[PDB]
Amino acid sequence: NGLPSETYITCAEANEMAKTDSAQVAEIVAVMGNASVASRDLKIEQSPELSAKVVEKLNQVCAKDPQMLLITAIDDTMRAIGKK
């Protein structure tokens, strides 16, 4: 009944927000993103080059699939780049 913002919002729309609040979106994708990636690998460090791209490619995925909720989309991207 109480759907969290990041659960009800799509990464494509998160990109839209970035036009108004880039730091807000970059922070969110970094917070759970860094934790998420480190939860499956644990060797992944706080690399700014990873976040910068984890959102760049992410919004493109949502642009093709609007059903990619932000909360899931980040985890999904962590799955893709979670094996380097």
- Residues 43 and 66: their CA atoms lie apart, in Å, by 31
Q: Quick one: CA torsion of 49, 69, 81, 61, rounded to 10 degrees? A: -80
Exposure string over 59-75, b if 16+ CB within 10 A, otherwise e = beebeeeeebbbbebbb
User: 25 near 18, Cβ under 8 Å?
Assistant: yes
CATH no., domain 1-84: 1.10.890.30
Method: NMR
Structure tokens, 5: 């913002």
